[PDB]
Coordinates of C-alpha atoms and ligand atoms in Angstrom, one line a residue:
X1314 CA -0.1 -0.3 0.1
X1315 CA 0.4 4.1 0.5
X1316 CA 0.3 3.9 3.9
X1317 CA 1.9 6.2 5.1
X1318 CA 0.1 8.7 3.3
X1319 CA -2.9 7.2 4.5
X1320 CA -1.7 6.9 7.8
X1321 CA -1.2 10.6 7.6
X1322 CA -4.3 11.2 6.0
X1323 CA -6.3 9.6 8.9
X1324 CA -4.5 11.9 11.3
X1325 CA -5.5 14.8 9.8
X1326 CA -9.4 13.4 9.5
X1327 CA -9.1 12.3 12.6
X1328 CA -8.3 15.4 14.1
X1329 CA -10.5 17.7 11.6
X1330 CA -13.4 16.5 13.9
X1331 CA -12.9 16.9 17.5
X1332 CA -15.1 17.6 20.4
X1333 CA -13.6 20.0 23.0
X1334 CA -14.3 16.7 24.7
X1335 CA -11.2 15.3 23.3
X1336 CA -8.3 16.6 25.1
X1337 CA -9.9 17.5 28.8
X1338 CA -11.4 13.8 28.7
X1339 CA -11.0 12.4 31.4
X1340 CA -9.5 8.5 31.2
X1341 CA -7.6 8.6 27.6
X1342 CA -4.6 11.2 28.8
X1343 CA -3.9 13.9 25.8
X1344 CA -0.5 14.2 27.1
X1345 CA 0.2 16.5 24.3
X1346 CA -1.7 19.3 23.0
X1347 CA -1.5 21.6 19.4
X1348 CA -3.0 24.8 19.0
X1349 CA -3.1 27.2 16.8
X1350 CA -3.8 31.2 17.1
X1351 CA -4.2 33.6 14.3
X1352 CA -4.1 37.2 15.9
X1353 CA -6.3 40.3 14.0
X1354 CA -4.4 42.9 11.8
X1355 CA -2.9 45.4 13.0
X1356 CA -3.4 49.6 12.6
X1357 CA 0.3 49.6 10.9
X1358 CA -0.5 47.1 9.2
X1359 CA -3.7 47.8 7.6
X1360 CA -1.7 51.3 7.5
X1361 CA 0.5 49.3 5.3
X1362 CA -2.8 47.8 3.4
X1363 CA -1.6 44.1 4.7
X1364 CA -4.3 41.6 2.7
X1365 CA -5.4 39.2 6.4
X1366 CA -4.7 35.6 4.2
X1367 CA -5.8 33.7 6.7
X1368 CA -9.1 31.5 8.1
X1369 CA -10.1 29.9 10.6
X1370 CA -13.4 28.2 9.3
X1371 CA -14.1 25.9 12.1
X1372 CA -12.6 25.0 16.1
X1373 CA -10.3 22.7 14.3
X1374 CA -9.4 24.0 11.3
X1375 CA -6.9 26.9 10.1
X1376 CA -6.6 27.8 5.9
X1377 CA -3.8 29.7 4.6
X1378 CA -4.7 31.5 1.5
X1379 CA -1.2 31.5 0.0
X1380 CA -1.2 34.6 -2.5
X1381 CA 1.1 32.9 -5.7
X1382 CA 1.9 33.6 -9.3
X1383 CA 2.2 31.7 -12.1
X1384 CA 4.8 31.5 -15.0
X1385 CA 3.0 33.6 -17.2
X1386 CA 2.4 36.1 -13.8
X1387 CA -1.2 35.4 -14.1
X1388 CA -2.7 35.5 -9.7
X1389 CA -4.0 32.9 -8.2
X1390 CA -3.9 30.8 -4.3
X1391 CA -3.4 27.9 -3.1
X1392 CA -5.1 27.7 -0.3
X1393 CA -3.7 25.6 2.6
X1394 CA -5.2 24.2 5.4
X1395 CA -4.0 22.8 8.8
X1396 CA -6.1 21.0 11.3
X1397 CA -5.3 21.7 14.8
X1398 CA -6.4 20.4 18.5
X1399 CA -7.8 23.8 18.5
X1400 CA -7.6 27.0 16.5
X1401 CA -8.2 30.4 17.4
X1402 CA -10.0 32.9 15.2
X1403 CA -8.6 36.9 15.2
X1404 CA -12.1 37.6 17.5
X1405 CA -10.5 34.7 20.5
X1406 CA -9.9 36.2 23.9
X1407 CA -6.9 35.1 26.2
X1408 CA -9.4 34.0 28.1
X1409 CA -10.6 31.9 25.7
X1410 CA -7.8 30.5 24.9
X1411 CA -6.5 29.8 28.4
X1412 CA -9.3 27.5 28.6
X1413 CA -8.8 25.2 26.1
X1414 CA -4.8 25.3 26.1
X1415 CA -3.4 25.4 29.9
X1416 CA -6.1 25.8 31.9
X1417 CA -6.7 21.8 31.6
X1418 CA -3.2 21.4 32.5
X1419 CA -4.2 23.0 35.8
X1420 CA -5.7 20.5 37.3
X1421 CA -2.0 18.3 36.6
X1422 CA -0.4 19.6 38.9
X1423 CA -2.8 19.1 41.7
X1424 CA -2.4 15.6 41.1
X1425 CA 1.1 15.5 41.5
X1426 CA 2.1 15.8 37.9
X1427 CA 4.0 17.9 35.7
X1428 CA 2.5 20.7 33.1
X1429 CA 4.0 22.6 30.6
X1430 CA 2.8 24.9 28.2
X1431 CA 4.3 26.6 25.3
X1432 CA 4.0 29.9 23.2
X1433 CA 5.7 29.4 19.6
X1434 CA 5.5 31.4 16.5
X1435 CA 7.1 35.1 14.4
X1436 CA 8.3 37.7 16.1
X1437 CA 4.8 40.2 17.0
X1438 CA 2.9 37.4 16.3
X1439 CA 1.4 37.4 20.2
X1440 CA 3.4 35.3 22.6
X1441 CA 3.6 37.7 24.9
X1442 CA 0.3 39.0 24.4
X1443 CA -0.9 35.8 24.9
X1444 CA 1.1 34.5 28.1
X1445 CA 2.7 37.6 29.4
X1446 CA -0.7 40.4 29.7
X1447 CA -1.9 42.4 27.1
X1448 CA 0.7 44.6 25.1
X1449 CA 1.0 45.7 30.4
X1450 CA -1.7 43.8 31.6
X1451 CA -0.2 40.5 34.0
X1452 CA -4.4 40.2 34.7
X1453 CA -5.1 39.1 31.3
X1454 CA -2.5 36.6 30.5
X1455 CA -2.3 32.9 30.4
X1456 CA 0.7 33.3 33.4
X1457 CA -2.1 35.3 35.3
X1458 CA -5.2 33.0 34.0
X1459 CA -3.3 30.2 35.1
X1460 CA -2.9 31.3 39.0
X1461 CA -5.8 32.9 40.1
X1462 CA -7.4 29.0 39.5
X1463 CA -4.3 27.6 41.4
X1464 CA -5.6 29.4 43.8
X1465 CA -9.3 28.3 43.6
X1466 CA -8.1 24.8 43.4
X1467 CA -6.7 25.1 46.7
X1468 CA -9.8 26.0 48.5
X1469 CA -11.8 23.2 47.2
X1470 CA -12.2 20.7 49.7
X1471 CA -11.0 17.7 47.8
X1472 CA -7.2 19.4 47.3
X1473 CA -7.6 21.2 51.6
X1474 CA -6.0 18.5 53.0
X1475 CA -2.7 18.4 51.1
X1476 CA -1.3 21.8 52.9
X1477 CA 0.1 23.1 50.2
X1478 CA 2.1 26.0 50.0
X1479 CA 2.3 27.9 46.2
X1480 CA 5.5 29.0 44.5
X1481 CA 6.3 31.0 41.6
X1482 CA 9.7 31.5 39.4
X1483 CA 9.9 33.4 36.9
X1484 CA 13.5 33.3 34.3
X1485 CA 15.1 34.5 31.3
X1486 CA 17.1 31.9 28.6
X1487 CA 19.3 34.2 26.9
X1488 CA 21.8 32.8 24.5
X1489 CA 22.9 29.5 27.1
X1490 CA 22.6 31.6 29.9
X1491 CA 19.4 31.7 32.9
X1492 CA 19.2 35.0 34.4
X1493 CA 16.6 35.0 37.5
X1494 CA 14.0 37.5 36.2
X1495 CA 12.6 38.2 40.2
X1496 CA 16.1 38.5 41.3
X1497 CA 17.8 41.5 39.3
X1498 CA 18.8 39.8 36.0
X1499 CA 21.1 37.9 38.4
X1500 CA 23.3 35.1 36.4
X1501 CA 22.4 31.3 37.7
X1502 CA 24.2 28.2 37.0
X1503 CA 22.9 24.9 35.5
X1504 CA 23.8 21.8 37.2
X1505 CA 23.3 18.3 36.0
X1506 CA 24.4 15.6 38.6
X1507 CA 25.0 11.5 37.4
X1508 CA 21.8 10.8 37.2
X1509 CA 20.9 13.3 34.9
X1510 CA 19.3 15.5 36.8
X1511 CA 18.9 19.7 36.3
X1512 CA 19.6 22.6 39.2
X1513 CA 18.9 26.1 38.4
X1514 CA 21.4 27.4 41.4
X1515 CA 19.9 30.3 42.9
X1516 CA 16.5 30.8 41.1
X1517 CA 14.2 32.8 44.2
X1518 CA 11.3 31.0 44.7
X1519 CA 8.9 33.5 46.2
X1520 CA 6.0 32.2 48.1
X1521 CA 2.4 33.7 47.3
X1522 CA -1.1 33.8 48.6
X1523 CA -3.3 35.3 46.5
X1524 CA -4.2 36.2 42.8
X1525 CA -2.5 39.6 43.6
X1526 CA 1.1 38.9 45.0
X1527 CA 1.7 36.7 41.4
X1528 CA 0.2 38.9 39.3
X1529 CA 2.7 41.8 41.6
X1530 CA 5.5 39.0 40.7
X1531 CA 5.0 38.9 37.0
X1532 CA 5.0 42.5 36.7
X1533 CA 8.2 43.5 38.7
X1534 CA 9.7 40.3 36.1
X1535 CA 8.5 41.0 32.6
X1536 CA 9.2 45.3 34.0
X1537 CA 12.7 44.3 34.8
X1538 CA 13.6 42.5 31.4
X1539 CA 14.4 45.8 29.5
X1540 CA 11.9 41.9 22.8
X1541 CA 12.9 38.6 21.0
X1542 CA 16.1 36.4 21.0
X1543 CA 15.9 35.0 24.2
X1544 CA 12.9 32.8 26.1
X1545 CA 11.0 33.5 28.8
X1546 CA 9.5 30.9 31.8
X1547 CA 7.3 31.8 34.6
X1548 CA 7.0 28.7 36.5
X1549 CA 4.2 28.0 38.9
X1550 CA 5.1 24.7 42.1
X1551 CA 3.0 23.8 44.7
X1552 CA 5.2 22.3 47.3
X1553 CA 3.8 20.4 50.8
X1554 CA 6.9 19.9 52.7
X1555 CA 8.6 22.4 51.1
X1556 CA 8.8 18.5 49.4
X1557 CA 7.5 19.3 45.8
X1558 CA 3.8 18.6 44.3
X1559 CA 3.6 19.8 41.3
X1560 CA 4.7 21.9 38.3
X1561 CA 3.6 23.5 35.8
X1562 CA 6.1 25.8 34.2
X1563 CA 4.8 28.1 31.3
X1564 CA 6.9 29.9 28.5
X1565 CA 7.3 32.1 26.2
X1566 CA 9.4 31.1 23.6
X1567 CA 11.8 33.1 21.4
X1568 CA 10.8 34.7 17.3
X1569 CA 11.2 31.0 15.2
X1570 CA 12.6 33.6 12.1
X1571 CA 16.4 33.5 12.3
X1572 CA 17.9 30.2 10.5
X1573 CA 19.6 33.3 11.0
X1574 CA 25.0 37.9 9.0
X1575 CA 28.1 37.5 11.3
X1576 CA 28.0 37.1 14.8
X1577 CA 24.3 38.0 15.9
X1578 CA 24.2 34.2 15.3
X1579 CA 21.9 33.6 18.6
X1580 CA 19.8 32.5 16.1
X1581 CA 22.3 29.3 15.6
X1582 CA 21.4 29.1 19.9
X1583 CA 17.8 29.8 19.4
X1584 CA 17.1 27.2 16.0
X1585 CA 19.1 24.4 18.6
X1586 CA 16.4 25.0 21.2
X1587 CA 13.7 24.9 19.1
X1588 CA 14.6 21.7 17.3
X1589 CA 14.8 20.3 20.5
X1590 CA 12.2 21.5 22.3
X1591 CA 10.3 19.4 19.5
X1592 CA 12.5 16.7 20.1
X1593 CA 11.4 16.4 23.9
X1594 CA 8.0 16.7 23.4
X1595 CA 8.0 14.2 21.3
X1596 CA 10.0 12.4 23.4
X1597 CA 7.4 12.4 25.9
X1598 CA 4.7 9.9 23.4
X1599 CA 7.1 7.3 24.2
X1600 CA 19.4 15.1 22.0
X1601 CA 21.4 18.9 20.9
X1602 CA 20.8 19.1 24.3
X1603 CA 19.9 22.7 24.7
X1604 CA 19.6 25.1 27.9
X1605 CA 15.5 25.2 27.7
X1606 CA 15.3 21.3 27.2
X1607 CA 17.6 21.2 29.9
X1608 CA 15.8 23.7 32.8
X1609 CA 13.0 21.7 32.2
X1610 CA 13.6 18.0 31.5
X1611 CA 12.0 17.2 34.3
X1612 CA 8.7 18.1 32.4
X1613 CA 9.1 15.7 29.4
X1614 CA 10.7 12.6 31.5
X1615 CA 7.7 12.5 34.0
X1616 CA 4.9 10.1 34.4
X1617 CA 2.2 12.0 34.4
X1618 CA 3.6 14.8 32.7
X1619 CA 1.4 17.6 29.6
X1620 CA 2.2 19.8 27.9
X1621 CA 0.3 22.3 25.5
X1622 CA 2.1 24.3 22.8
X1623 CA 0.3 27.3 21.0
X1624 CA 1.1 28.5 17.7
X1625 CA 0.9 32.3 17.3
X1626 CA 0.4 33.5 13.8
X1627 CA 1.0 36.5 12.3
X1628 CA -2.4 37.2 9.7
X1629 CA -0.2 39.6 7.1
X1630 CA 0.0 39.0 3.3
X1631 CA 4.0 39.6 4.1
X1632 CA 4.0 37.0 6.8
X1633 CA 3.5 34.1 5.1
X1634 CA 6.3 32.3 4.3
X1635 CA 6.9 32.9 8.6
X1636 CA 2.9 31.7 8.8
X1637 CA 3.5 28.8 6.6
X1638 CA 6.9 28.3 8.3
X1639 CA 5.6 28.8 11.9
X1640 CA 2.3 25.9 10.9
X1641 CA 5.5 23.2 9.4
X1642 CA 7.0 23.0 13.6
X1643 CA 3.3 22.5 14.7
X1644 CA 2.6 20.2 12.3
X1645 CA 6.1 18.5 12.9
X1646 CA 5.3 18.7 16.9
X1647 CA 1.4 16.8 16.4
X1648 CA 2.6 14.0 14.3
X1649 CA 4.2 11.9 17.2
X1650 CA 0.2 11.4 19.4
Ligands
LIG2712 N1 -5.0 38.3 19.8 C1 -4.6 39.8 19.7 N2 -5.7 40.8 19.6 C2 -4.5 42.5 20.4 N3 -3.8 42.7 20.0 C3 -2.3 41.6 20.0 C4 -2.9 40.5 19.8 N4 -2.0 39.7 19.8 C5 -0.7 40.4 20.0 N5 -1.2 41.5 20.1 C6 -0.1 43.3 19.7 O1 0.8 42.7 18.8 C7 2.0 43.6 19.7 C8 3.2 42.0 19.5 O2 2.7 41.0 20.3 P1 3.7 40.2 21.4 O3 2.9 39.3 22.0 O4 4.7 41.4 21.8 O5 4.3 39.4 19.9 P2 5.5 38.2 20.4 O6 5.0 37.3 20.7 O7 6.3 37.8 19.1 O8 6.4 39.1 20.9 C9 1.3 43.3 20.9 O9 1.2 44.9 20.9 C10 0.1 42.8 21.3 O10 -0.9 43.7 22.4
LIG2713 MG1 5.2 39.8 22.4

């Protein structure tokens, strides 16, 4: 047969119908969740008469109206379809996006589980807008939202007898070097031991109690950081006896369009890490180690470990080549599940 094609086709088909009952399902463990989010064209983009070339006709489908010239100059479209677990159009808010990406994973930490949620995509696409908050608005972004609901889940009966402390970290990863955003960008050192386990020495874990505390911390970190070229990782830890119960690492990745002049070849580092991250993620469905995947190594290797990739799309015509690139990385992540 042509079975590889048949398999790829099936995988497409299956994803193309899904209810929101599939990721949020009990008793099936959707370990890997891949999403896409089209942001609207902004006024500068409108001002430059940019054509919106992206459509999101269903919850599980996204279309690229790839503009093309035939050899004889004749204009046409190659309308390309991609399907994801969720696809959010230019109307979907952060709270809506949060509801189907990260929120499901909150419970995983209170179940003694590890969680990761990545914002992936080109620069100016909305990674920080989604994760940090409206570009700022710490409270209108996933970091905060996840936290809001971490506190809510502790006050429920089922999870009150755990005697939990809520800790919080926040750091930047830039050219192989970690920097604590809660400790004045202090350059930290990353140690692997014999067991191949990682420690980020001197990474400050602030205890928190209310959501507003966390909003304060997120704003300190974001402030004490000054765009792309660097990863940002905000973590939420639940400790019981100062022993770690569960961990949610929320990451605002770097610009994915730097496959690379001379010596601004941080784009080498950025590339290695994104390639790394991809491989790591696909190991959570069963190399070239980067500082990012090293620091997050526990959050993939685990038994109850879950993840969520949110691919950000810039809808402009001028961005199409970058958009198509973003979508292939995303396709290639879903590929194993
Ligand atoms: N879904 C959206 N709705 C409205 N504005 C958005 C949206 N996504 C991004 N933006 C705006 O676009 C700009 C670029 O977003 P940003 O998240 O900083 O890009 P990047 O993810 O590359 O860092 C910001 O001003 C942000 O407020
Ligand atoms: Mg941003």
